Design a protein around this ligand. Structure first.
Ligand SMILES: *[C@@H]1O[C@H](CO)[C@@H](O[C@@H]2O[C@H](CO)[C@@H](O[C@@H]3O[C@H](CO)[C@@H](O)[C@H](O)[C@H]3NC(C)=O)[C@H](O)[C@H]2NC(C)=O)[C@H](O)[C@H]1NC(C)=O
Ligand SMILES: *[C@@H]1O[C@H](CO)[C@@H](O[C@@H]2O[C@H](CO)[C@@H](O)[C@H](O)[C@H]2NC(C)=O)[C@H](O)[C@H]1NC(C)=O
Ligand SMILES: *[C@@H]1O[C@H](CO)[C@@H](O[C@@H]2O[C@H](CO)[C@@H](O)[C@H](O)[C@H]2NC(C)=O)[C@H](O)[C@H]1NC(C)=O
Ligand SMILES: *[C@@H]1O[C@H](CO)[C@@H](O)[C@H](O)[C@H]1NC(C)=O
Ligand SMILES: *[C@@H]1O[C@H](CO)[C@@H](O)[C@H](O)[C@H]1NC(C)=O
Ligand SMILES: *[C@@H]1O[C@H](CO)[C@@H](O)[C@H](O)[C@H]1NC(C)=O
Ligand SMILES: *[C@@H]1O[C@H](CO)[C@@H](O)[C@H](O)[C@H]1NC(C)=O
Ligand SMILES: *[C@@H]1O[C@H](CO)[C@@H](O)[C@H](O)[C@H]1NC(C)=O
Lengths: 48, 145, 48, 48, 338
């Protein structure tokens, strides 16, 4: 999913998932969660 | 998950070349079983045409039991300077959203996904208006539309 | 004995730094405003 | 222990905002442990 | 989650045509890539400069590259005022190319000038701009004898509306089983064909070429369908197609620099599979023999990962470029970035 020119509700994303592991390179979660970006790209899959 | 994806070649079909994917790319063995593998270690064979290279493409798939709760993986990537529109968290329009009266004072600007510190003045239009940011040789912002 | 000159040496910034490895050169493209300054400085010193 | 990722430095949850933020002015260690059955520390009714 | 292509073609069989590759292969009016006259240059994304020269590393064509030349002919018509009978096309549809990095297209090169008519060598008339049609995909197959047909999902880019609308749809092509169609008995070639009388000299039908396409393939589940509007003129222009992790980006000069010729992005389609092959669809023009007019060729240059030296005017447009690897003097000029 490619996101450009939109706004996302963080309240929902906090509740719809229970995070078990963060691992970030170059960025931190509370910079995607507090800053505005030219584009987001999310690759999602089902993984044990 | 796919555990073996290799190309068979040879008159005796005795040459195996493992096929590896590049970052952020799909696999040629994706279309063997797009949904899932019905049995552990399931093996599929398919023939390739001359345009792709030819031979017997081979795939093997492994099956892992489903857990009580669906567990998911996400890869998030942020791209800078890929346009003139931005992705943002839902937030109220800040009262600091105007600059018409604070010309000449150092401010921390966050404009459409480009961030920095600067002083704004009124100037004549240069560059292409369509792209909203004018840069110098050293990748510093010098004009804003 | 009176010395009147030194040996004129010039350097290739993209060969000294990255010994022909294309993996290294691609990271040096972000640089290369620091290579020209080395190349231009040595050209002037040899010109003088 | 199921919310360990939310106590890490750089999480995007509500723990660093309204619950607990760690200070890195000094050498620090964040330890998550489990109290054995026979150790006398009364459990709360739930986590909050 | 699928757009519906409800007006499916009910045609009994695909239209007959005669393919003659030798006739088109003879014509040649080369256009080597010349950095001095800015050619096929993608303007930097999301940023502009004014009155400055710098070095940009991106997707650029090679200097002095001949490219590939494609021609669109007229249609066979019996009688001076008779309606067109059958299509005259080249074998473009049977050839599979590589999309490795992307490609740029010179369009409307021979506009405003006289030239021969392909179908009738004797007739010489003024040439008109003809936009290309593309199919891009990631996997292939054959009918039975080796004619190439695209697999599950294909991006199809077709101009319509007598050169006034551009249609791009990412969807599934199912070979139709009609007579002499790709799933039929005698499959010579697939092409798009439009009658000038139906649309151009009337309320312009923005679906003619798409309707012709539906005769050859059925549009199975067929995710998305996008359409942009094209102003009608006879100016030369540039077009470009690129792909990366955000999808398939489309560039054109008409979006921002109609006269200078710099290419600006206007669309980012969500095609993330990874395009490996592309093919030009023959586009025959159908009308009477007297109305027959020659249509300008287009040139498909191939993009490579290169560095150029770009000169930006005060208005922000590019007027001079140097390919930094063509020869020693070019590398010297880029080394001093001036
Ligand atoms: C083929 O013929 C076309 C017309 O038959 C030519 O189209 C003309 O191109 C001119 C530029 O070469 C245009 O001039 C522009 O006019 C606008 C309107 O006022 C100005 O803003 C622009 O500044 C001006 N361009 C420049 C560079 O100053 C004409 O308007 C335009 N006319 C029509 C009817 O389209 C083609 O140029 C000509 N050559 C080619 C290669 O197609
Ligand atoms: C041209 O063809 C397109 C097919 O892509 C038509 O768009 C669809 O038309 C059908 C039939 O009316 C509708 O049910 C669909 O909802 C349309 N698609 C969308 C996305 O709205 C289009 O109407 C045709 N135009 C003309 C003039 O025939
Ligand atoms: C075209 O596709 C066919 C099947 O889809 C491929 O199979 C061969 O087809 C040729 C004739 O086209 C037959 O003589 C062979 O016996 C077929 N092989 C098998 C194993 O059945 C064919 O390889 C593809 N390519 C060409 C050039 O025909
Ligand atoms: C958080 O999400 C809720 C949805 O229930 C929404 O009403 C609220 O506005 C969001 N927070 C902010 C700051 O927008
Ligand atoms: C297509 O036509 C060209 C021009 O003659 C020819 O060289 C080529 O072999 C043809 N290809 C096919 C597949 O017919
Ligand atoms: C553009 O840059 C040149 C290079 O120094 C300079 O001489 C000139 O004044 C600048 N402005 C214009 C309008 O050319
Ligand atoms: C793609 O098309 C081929 C053609 O036969 C088919 O075998 C294959 O299953 C298709 N792929 C998917 C994912 O359905
Ligand atoms: C189109 O979608 C339907 C339902 O989603 C599916 O059954 C069908 O196989 C799809 N078409 C192809 C060619 O796979």
């Amino acid at each position: 999913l490619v996101f450009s020119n939109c706004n996302y509700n963080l309240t929902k994303l906090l509740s719809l998932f229970a995070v078990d592991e963060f691992s970030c390179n170059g960025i931190s979660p509370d910079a995607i969660a507090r800053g505005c970006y030219s584009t987001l790209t999310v690759d999602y899959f089902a993984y044990p | 998950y796919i555990s073996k994806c290799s190309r068979l070649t040879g008159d005796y079909q005795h040459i195996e070349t493992p096929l590896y994917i590049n970052p952020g790319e799909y696999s040629i063995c994706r279309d063997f079983a797009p949904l899932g593998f019905s049995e552990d270690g399931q093996v599929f064979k398919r023939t390739l045409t001359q345009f792709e290279g030819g031979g017997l493409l081979i795939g093997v798939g492994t099956r892992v039991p489903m857990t009580a709760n669906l567990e998911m993986g996400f890869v998030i990537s942020v791209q800078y300077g890929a346009g003139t529109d931005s992705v943002c968290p839902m937030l109220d329009l800040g009262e600091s959203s105007t600059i018409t009266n604070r010309l000449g004072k150092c401010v921390d600007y966050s404009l459409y996904g480009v961030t920095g510190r600067g002083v704004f003045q009124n100037c004549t239009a240069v560059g292409v208006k369509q792209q909203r940011f004018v840069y110098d040789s050293f990748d510093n912002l010098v004009g804003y539309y | 004995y009176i010395e009147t000159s030194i040996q004129k040496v010039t350097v290739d910034c993209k060969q000294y730094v990255c010994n022909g490895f294309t993996r290294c050169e691609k990271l040096l493209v972000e640089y290369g405003q620091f290579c020209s300054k080395i190349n231009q400085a040595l050209h002037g010193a040899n010109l003088r | 222990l199921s919310m360990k990722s939310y106590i890490r430095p750089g999480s995007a949850g509500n723990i660093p905002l309204y619950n607990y933020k760690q200070s890195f002015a000094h050498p620090t260690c964040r330890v998550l442990a489990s109290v054995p059955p026979n150790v006398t520390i009364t459990k709360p009714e739930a986590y909050g | 989650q699928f757009v519906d292509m409800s007006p499916a073609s009910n045609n009994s069989e695909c239209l007959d045509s005669q393919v003659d590759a030798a006739a088109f292969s003879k014509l040649m009016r080369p256009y080597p890539i010349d950095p001095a006259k800015v050619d096929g240059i993608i303007y930097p994304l999301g940023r502009t400069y004014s009155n400055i020269t710098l070095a940009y590393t991106g997707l650029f064509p090679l200097q002095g590259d001949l490219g590939t030349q494609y021609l669109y002919s007229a249609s066979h018509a019996v009688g001076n005022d008779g309606d067109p009978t059958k299509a005259y096309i080249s074998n473009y549809s049977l050839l599979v190319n590589d999309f490795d990095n992307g490609f740029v297209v010179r369009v409307g090169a021979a506009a405003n000038s006289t030239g021969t008519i392909v179908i009738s060598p004797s007739v010489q008339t003024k040439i008109k701009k003809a936009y290309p049609a593309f199919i891009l995909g990631s996997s292939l197959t054959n009918t039975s004898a080796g004619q190439p047909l695209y697999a599950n999902y294909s991006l199809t880019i077709i101009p319509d509306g007598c050169g006034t609308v551009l249609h791009a749809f990412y969807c599934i092509l199912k070979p139709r089983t009609g007579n002499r169609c790709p799933g039929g008995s005698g499959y010579n070639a697939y092409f798009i064909y439009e009658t000038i009388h139906n649309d151009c000299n009337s309320a312009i039908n923005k679906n003619a070429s798409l309707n012709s396409f539906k005769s050859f393939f059925d549009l199975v589940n067929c995710t998305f369908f996008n359409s942009w509007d094209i102003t009608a003129d006879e100016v030369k222009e540039w077009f470009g197609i690129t792909q990366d992790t955000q999808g398939v980006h489309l560039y054109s000069s008409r979006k921002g620099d109609l006269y200078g010729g710099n290419m600006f992005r206007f669309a980012t389609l969500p095609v993330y599979e990874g395009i490996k092959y592309y093919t030009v669809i023959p586009r025959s023009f159908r009308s009477k023999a007297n109305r027959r007019e020659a249509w300008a060729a287009f040139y498909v240059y191939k993009l490579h990962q290169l560095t150029y030296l770009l000169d930006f005017s005060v208005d922000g447009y590019i007027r001079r470029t140097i390919d930094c690897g063509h020869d020693d003097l070019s590398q010297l000029h880029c080394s001093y970035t001036s």
